[PDB]
Ligand binder design. Structure first.
Ligand SMILES: Nc1ncnc2c1ncn2[C@@H]1O[C@H](COP(=O)(O)OP(=O)(O)OP(O)(O)=S)[C@@H](O)[C@H]1O
Ligand SMILES: Nc1ncnc2c1ncn2[C@@H]1O[C@H](COP(=O)(O)OP(=O)(O)OP(O)(O)=S)[C@@H](O)[C@H]1O
Ligand SMILES: Nc1ncnc2c1ncn2[C@@H]1O[C@H](COP(=O)(O)OP(=O)(O)OP(O)(O)=S)[C@@H](O)[C@H]1O
Ligand SMILES: Nc1ncnc2c1ncn2[C@@H]1O[C@H](COP(=O)(O)OP(=O)(O)OP(O)(O)=S)[C@@H](O)[C@H]1O
Ligand SMILES: [Mg+2]
Ligand SMILES: [Mg+2]
Ligand SMILES: [Mg+2]
Ligand SMILES: [Mg+2]
Lengths: 737, 737
């Protein structure tokens, strides 16, 4: 019901199509009930448009060539004047459009190449086929007694509609044959189909660019301020320039690209004139889009700058963006790879308030990027893209293109023994029959160094409740504090209470403190930001107080989301504990966390998990009624839950039938979950060794698990069990003394 | 099978050659089955090319001078128009090539030197020898009744093929005799044969430069993006300019060298025009290579710069490299000695993504450099290059050239008593009979200070399993966790488990904590990066947070590789231990190691070793299931393994026969391996003293070892043995409390 806007169905007119044996393109397909509900105006001419000012003409009411009471669609139209079946016809009445001076005809191929002679001897014959020299906007017919592979590039035209040319005007004939680069750089313009992964941000870009420009009166009638400043920020190489280039081609607005280094490459004084002219050009036409690439390169912070020209550039840009009123209809957007260096005077209201985060795509997101990038190459049958999307983790849009290039080149290397190095006249059986296989992708995958290993990884984790063995007590409670306030807000609002925002995890180490948070994030279909203990201590030492500011608000922007603080023990380990150095464990970072976690409003859905295994050195400041008041104890797995833990850990291994899990679960009493995983890893490693020994069968037998128990190592002592139990019954008493 | 691409064999046409007594060069060697499989076109002329536009002509079908049914090859062609036997003939059809204005003949030697007279009296006689003035592209015959040592330098020519000159054109005759420097600086151009050691990086350079330029259509057919930015980085003096100069001479592309300081030597404003002209010159010719030497000198970081001209230069360079599309076919490459000062805006995608590491060569690598450098000098019979390669450790390409220069000059000093200092007319018996001997090399080797002592040393270590005595338990296990996941990935992938990445070494000190890591690195044929304890503490104090970033990723780039953290005790010693100053031992560096070691993907083959001898002060954060979960105990050598330790330590000493190893191994119970090495060192030192005493025999006798036992010193106390045993049984319990 909520997602019933993208669908378009329940209309008994459209039907599925498949491959048929009807390839007769003599006449185009029409519809008899089409004009029956429309009131057209006839008598001189009709104004209509198709796609990219390109339309075809045919015969009208000259049927009776084949059998009626049927329909068909040829597959021939997938290479010109068409991108796919299911294109909506867009017609906008707009007379008096841009016009050139005059162009009649120009030659490209038949200019000087080969024999010329008188030139009216070779193409005059294959022309008289019932056509009185039809002149239109792309009416070209295919007639050839040979290969039927003739094509001439005629793209540039001054008119949108048809027109009648008039005599008594002189035309210059000083043209020149052009190369293929200018046409290829224009035909390969990207659009909304060439971008994948960032399916969410494109909705915002469309709703905030296309809507105000296409319907200016609709926004004025309801009285809404159109956003005129959009800043695109995120990791480098995610494709920030690609959306900017895509939104320009699909809109009828005048696009003006402004580069960052290009502006600074000019001399002193001359650079400001470029910005002034760029704004003036966009101002005199109402549909105009201004994109400033790499804003940080031209608009740095005024508190760190050294040159006086940069300050003048920033001041000029500030004045120019303030001079734009609502009658300009100019949407200024910019892209940068670090939002932190942008001058704060630009990111405030009226200049740049609307911000779009281009984050790192998921396995689903990068799968579509791979499918887009590999759409032009030739792959084999064993080519599995979602696998490669799975193993790739920190890969961004440009990383995938580099990986594809490396995989393609590795395929080139395998054929170097047959392809001559000096002879350039290679045979034609090597440009087509060779495709990229799995050895190529797997080889190139091992030595790929992505540029996106350092940011926060924003997912719904893949860890579900199946990976966690036992612990049925905590599964219900963790749901009761996370899912209820987000699924049924009315039930909470009726009682007039405040849901608790924050849960602390403590207990013996290696028992599921991280898997629980990942599982509770997976089921809620929300994001998951994990921050480790030493991860906070290294990200500070450069004396950077603003580093965590873009971390806390990131969770708020990606609502709903959960915040995880794993390995909290190491954070308190830097100063000790109850006495520590001389006082508590609340060092520089703990105070930061406490100060910022108080500013989160209750009406939000942001949620925080803290996980630690050192309750004796934690400070009372963390456990406040409103920060981490929920204290949940994870006990050691007992006889009943170890079977489930082992079943979860053995889901991917071909375990035998004669092995008894509950039998080997009965003297593994005083262990933890991490100990059981290590036991299983040793047991399966013994299987690998045995399997490879006999080669000079690959199943985990009973003896493989029997040998592991003798070498088993206990991770928690008897004193620690009692100590954990005695803290678990009584923790919050630590507050006060 | 994997390395079957470099070989070229199984063709019954080529055979080995040796020194023969046939030196008749009247006719060249041909092949009768050569045209039998080729369909040539005859009737006017044939187009063909040899090497460097130089070919020889001879008589055709004028045989019957000697016996047939045999073949021979003269040794005379090793000084001109030839570099060696086994050169492939390269022929590329390309008409209409670069042409000059006109040159007929120019005199060089017979211009004004000596007697001239009428000049048509001395060389007209020795010319009429059945030759109707043959004019070609290097058809010179040797005819002289004297020494047969006549040679004139004719190198510059406008045509590649033969041509017929035409009259009715005026030719200027205002030439001048040139010196020998311009010809020597061009004939000594380096190539792929003048560079040794970096055999791996040259493959990447070739595959990423020569392939896209020689076969532009092959890459377009498969749809692969050609790399247009290559950055060469590494230690200074490794030869970064040499590869740049070598790749230009062997390619037919237009090379444009851009120096770093040369650009900045210009005035304000005039420097940008040089870059603009350099790019414009390369753009109008499709085959073009642009090399920017010392990029850091012209493209520094914008956050540290002071002048405004440098920022404009960086912005201009950024704009220019962005303006290059695929139709330019221009590959821009650059070299720098510090990659860290390069502006981050240049090292990202689209400008400089493809990076080549020119590391320090090995003993094998530097051996080839020595062989290349000494190929022009005259050495004696006792000259052993691989020895000198062995003792040289931190020596780079320029260090070896300096060492050779010093060794040559030391040879000059030995003859100063006979060579006159003021008389310049020295006898000819001192420029040839004097060669460099071992006293020269050994003398110059002692006072050589290399410039490459400070980086990370990336090898496969020379320490093998033979150097480690006993410890048969750890040898199998260390293999079972390193070699199996890299040799049989399918066996691991079938069971669907995660191999453990990380092994911690603990135990009594001086027992083989470093030799084990070196041995496991040697057998895997992988790299080995060793980082010591205090080595991390000194590399920090300058408040440099980016220093270790280029350390961790270096191991990933050189896959497979192992990471070693030796002397971990000193790192934890700076803050104490369980209580320490006030808390744990996890100071600034430990948190860094933990944060970065979590980011390594499982699918990689990077592996980490930690070695320590202070398990009581280690913190629980290191021992996490996924960082260093593998805990291996190295016990003290018992009675059985001490014999092997002594045998390993005595492999290079001439040990006598009457000495009994197991007899002296029976009361050396409570020692360690380092104690046995020290015992053997004292025992052999006593032998040196005895050998030199009697001179005013050189074998280690029984009494030499008997005297060492009395002076033996124990390194581990009884309390320490029990304490180590009690921690070894129970370590991981330290996690939690
Ligand atoms: N979602 C995507 N789909 C397809 N190609 C993408 C995508 N994102 C990036 N790319 C490719 O990545 C390359 C570089 O794209 P850019 O837009 O230049 O990256 P960026 O995020 O703007 O950062 P920089 O500063 O420009 S490198 C191009 O070859 C794009 O085609
Ligand atoms: N309930 C469980 N069932 C199965 N495996 C578990 C369970 N709890 C933990 N593990 C395993 O234990 C290892 C680490 O799990 P974590 O949840 O990170 O442990 P932890 O409780 O957070 O304490 P540490 O200090 O991080 S080991 C992984 O290999 C998990 O698969
Ligand atoms: N692999 C090598 N083989 C032979 N000579 C080498 C090699 N590497 C360096 N050299 C010599 O080292 C000297 C300097 O070489 P360069 O290319 O200038 O060094 P570099 O690595 O470029 O660093 P700088 O900044 O130029 S000193 C020359 O005499 C080279 O012949
Ligand atoms: N198993 C062994 N066999 C022979 N020599 C050994 C053995 N173990 C150590 N040594 C010698 O001991 C010395 C130092 O070896 P290391 O492996 O570096 O000692 P360690 O265990 O790392 O502890 P320290 O603190 O570095 S001495 C060298 O001279 C080695 O040859
Ligand atoms: Mg960009
Ligand atoms: Mg955990
Ligand atoms: Mg240099
Ligand atoms: Mg050592």
């Amino acid at each position: 019901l909520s997602t019933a806007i993208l669908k378009q169905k329940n209309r008994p007119n459209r039907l599925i199509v498949d491959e048929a044996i009807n390839e007769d393109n003599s006449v185009v397909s029409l519809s008899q009930p089409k004009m029956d509900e429309l009131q057209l105006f006839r008598g001189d001419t009709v104004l209509l448009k198709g796609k990219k000012r390109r339309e075809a003409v045919c015969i009208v009411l000259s049927d009776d060539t084949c059998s009626d009471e049927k329909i068909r669609m040829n597959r021939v139209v997938r290479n010109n004047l068409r991108v796919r079946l299911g294109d909506v016809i867009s017609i906008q009445p707009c007379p008096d459009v841009k016009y050139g001076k005059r162009i009649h005809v120009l030659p490209i191929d038949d200019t000087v190449e080969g024999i010329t002679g008188n030139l009216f001897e070779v193409y005059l014959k294959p022309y008289f086929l019932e056509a009185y020299r039809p002149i239109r906007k792309g009416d070209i017919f295919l007639v050839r007694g040979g290969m039927r592979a003739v094509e001439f590039k005629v793209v540039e035209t001054d008119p949108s509609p048809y027109c009648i040319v008039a005599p008594d005007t002189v035309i210059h004939c000083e043209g020149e044959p052009i190369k293929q680069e200018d046409e290829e750089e224009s035909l390969n313009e990207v659009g909304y189909d060439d971008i994948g992964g960032c399916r969410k941000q494109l909705a915002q870009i469309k709703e905030m660019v296309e809507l105000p420009l296409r319907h200016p009166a609709l926004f004025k009638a309801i009285g809404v301020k159109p956003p005129r400043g959009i800043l695109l920020y995120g990791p480098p190489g995610t494709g920030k320039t690609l959306i900017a280039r895509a939104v320009a081609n699909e809109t009828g607005a005048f696009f003006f690209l402004i580069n960052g280094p290009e502006i600074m490459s000019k001399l002193a004084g001359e650079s400001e004139s470029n910005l002034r002219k760029a704004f003036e050009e966009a101002e005199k036409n109402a549909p105009a889009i201004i994109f400033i690439d790499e804003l940080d390169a031209i608009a740095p912070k005024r508190e760190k700058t050294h040159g006086e020209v940069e300050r003048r550039i920033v001041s000029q840009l500030l004045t120019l963006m303030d001079g734009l009123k609502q009658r300009a209809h100019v949407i200024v957007m910019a892209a940068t790879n670090r939002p932190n260096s942008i001058d704060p005077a630009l990111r405030r209201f009226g200049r740049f308030d609307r911000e779009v985060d281009i984050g790192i795509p998921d396995a689903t997101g990068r799968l579509e990027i791979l499918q887009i990038h590999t759409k032009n190459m030739k792959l084999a049958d064993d080519v599995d893209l979602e696998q490669v999307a799975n193993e790739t983790h920190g890969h961004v849009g440009a990383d995938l293109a580099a990986l594809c290039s490396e995989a393609a080149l590795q395929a080139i290397r395998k054929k170097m023994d047959l392809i001559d190095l000096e002879d350039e006249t290679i045979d034609a059986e090597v440009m087509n029959s060779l495709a990229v296989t799995m050895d190529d992708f797997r080889w190139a995958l091992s030595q790929s160094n992505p540029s996106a290993l350092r940011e926060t990884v924003v997912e719904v984790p893949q860890v579900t409740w199946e990976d966690i063995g036992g612990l049925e007590d905590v599964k219900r409670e963790l749901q009761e504090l996370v899912q209820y306030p987000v699924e049924h807000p009315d039930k909470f609002l009726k009682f007039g209470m405040t849901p608790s925002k924050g849960v602390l995890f403590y207990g013996p180490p290696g028992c599921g403190k991280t898997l629980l948070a990942k599982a509770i994030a997976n089921e809620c279909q929300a994001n998951f930001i994990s921050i480790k203990g030493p991860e906070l201590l290294t990200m500070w030492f450069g004396e950077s107080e603003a580093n965590v500011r873009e971390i806390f608000d990131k969770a708020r922007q990606a609502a709903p989301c959960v915040l995880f603080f794993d390995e909290l023990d190491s954070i308190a380990k830097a100063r000790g504990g109850n006495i520590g150095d001389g006082g508590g464990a609340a060092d520089r970072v703990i105070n930061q966390i406490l100060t910022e976690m108080d500013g989160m409003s209750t009406k939000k859905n942001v949620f925080i998990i803290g996980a630690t295994n050192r309750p004796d050195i934690i400070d009372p400041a963390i456990l406040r009624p409103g920060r981490l008041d929920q204290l949940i104890y994870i006990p050691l797995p007992d006889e009943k839950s170890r079977v489930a833990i082992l079943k979860a850990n053995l889901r991917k291994s071909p375990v035998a039938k004669d092995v008894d899990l509950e039998f080997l679960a009965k003297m593994t009493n005083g262990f933890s979950g991490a100990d059981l995983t290590e036991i299983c890893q040793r047991a399966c490693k013994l299987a690998i060794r045995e399997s490879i020994e006999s080669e000079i069968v690959p199943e985990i037998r009973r003896d493989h698990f029997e040998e592991a128990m003798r070498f088993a190592r206990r991770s928690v002592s008897d004193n620690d069990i009692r100590k954990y139990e005695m803290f678990a019954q009584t923790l919050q008493q630590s507050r006060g003394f």
